[PDB]
Structure formats: C-alpha cells, structure tokens
Amino acid sequence: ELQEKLIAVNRVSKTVKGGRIFSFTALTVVGDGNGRVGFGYGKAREVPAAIQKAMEKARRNMINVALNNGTLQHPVKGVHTGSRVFMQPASEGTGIIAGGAMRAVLEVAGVHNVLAKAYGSTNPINVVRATIDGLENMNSPEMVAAKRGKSVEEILGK
C-alpha cells in the first residue's frame, strides 16, 4: 500500500576520550502514490536500525497534497535552509524530470509528470524538506474558489 524509498545513508562521527564513535543516519520517504507523502530521518549505530527508525518516523509524518491527475496544480517554489526548489506541471508522458532527492518525494507522492529544478544547496535533507513544503503549499481550484467565495467555473472560466 505504501511505497517507501531510501534516499541517503550517511556516516557521522563524534569524538570521545578514547577516540571517534561512528554512527549512521538514514533519510527516507513514504507515500501512498495518491497525494500523501512523508519523510523520516533516523539515527542509529547500525544502518538497518537507522533505516527502520526513519521508516517509522516517515509513516507518522505524512502530509496531504492536492494533485491534478498525476501532476501539479501550478508552478511552485519551495525553500528550506540553503535549498530552493522549483516545480511545474508537465504534459502526460513527460515523466519526472527532477534530481534524485526530489524524484523520490515526487514518485512516492504520486506525481507522474513534472519539471523540477534544485537551486542553492542540494543537501538531500533540506531538499526533501523544501520539496515537501512546496507540495504542501500547492493550491487547488476548489480551495481557491472556496477561499475567494466564488465558483470553480468562475475561477477557471473564460
């Protein structure tokens, strides 16, 4: 039911009196392929434990995205820390034209066609955060009409 993807595993270190203690971090995303997506970040002495923790957090941190037939509603910009991302809808058959970190998020969320670009820092943790922020801030015609007190036809008419 839920598609899970491991985006990056990194080895970090802290120094103690006897020397360096290594550990691992895992960044993952989960999604239902129908507008729900979440990301998890886990730390452990071992890679499988870190990955399991990340999946556990991702399953709990899901948000909702208003998709339009497997594409975005409109161009969106997202930002987190040094990472800036830009995404726009594309015609059917275009595919996911995006870098790896954005691609995992978009694919588990269920975006099938999109043109994307990452500016600034391409650190995967912050790129994932910026991508999810843009998707969560995307608007749909229903929301726009409701908030403006108009009808969907008046929003998208002549």
Partner 1 sequence: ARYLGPKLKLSRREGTDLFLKSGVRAIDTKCKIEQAPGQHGARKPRLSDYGVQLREKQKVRRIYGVLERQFRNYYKEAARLKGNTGENLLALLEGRLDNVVYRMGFGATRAEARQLVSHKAIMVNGRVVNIASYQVSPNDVVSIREKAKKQSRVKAALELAEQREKPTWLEVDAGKMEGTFKRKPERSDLSADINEHLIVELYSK
Partner 2 sequence: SMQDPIADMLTRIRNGQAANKAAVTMPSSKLKVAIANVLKEEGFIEDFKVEGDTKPELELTLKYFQGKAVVESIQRVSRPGLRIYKRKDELPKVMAGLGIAVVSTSKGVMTDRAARQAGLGGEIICYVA
Q: Which residues bind RNA (CB under 7 A)?
A: 84, 86, 117, 119-120
Strands (E), 45-92: 63-64, 76-80, 83-89
CA 107 to CA 35: how far, in whole Å? 10
CB of 68 vs partner 2, minimal distance in Å = 10
Residue type, 8: A
Interacting residue ranges for partner 1, rule: CB under 8 A: 92-97, 100, 103, 112
Q: Which partner in RNA, partner 2, partner 1, none is near 45 (CB below 5 to 8 A by kind)?
A: none
SS3 63: strand
Binding region for partner 2 (CB under 8 A) out of 36-44, 54-62, 72-80, 97-105: 72-80
The structure tokens 């500016």 sit at: 119
Per-residue contact string for residues 16-55; x = within reach of partner 2 by CB under 8 A = ----------------------------------------
Q: Which partner in RNA, partner 2, partner 1, none is near 136 (CB below 5 to 8 A by kind)?
A: none
CB of 119 vs partner 1, minimal distance in Å = 18
CA 126 to CA 82: how far, in whole Å? 7
Quick one: which H or E segment has residue 77? Answer: strand 76-80
The structure tokens 């975005």 sit at: 72
Per-residue contact string for residues 135-154; x = within reach of partner 2 by CB under 8 A = ----x-x--x-xxxxx----
Contacts of 158 (CB under 8 A, 6+ apart): none
Phi and psi at 87, nearest 5°, equal -135, 150
Please report, as ranges, the residues that interact with partner 2 according to CB under 8 A: 73-75, 89, 139, 141, 144, 146-150, 155-158
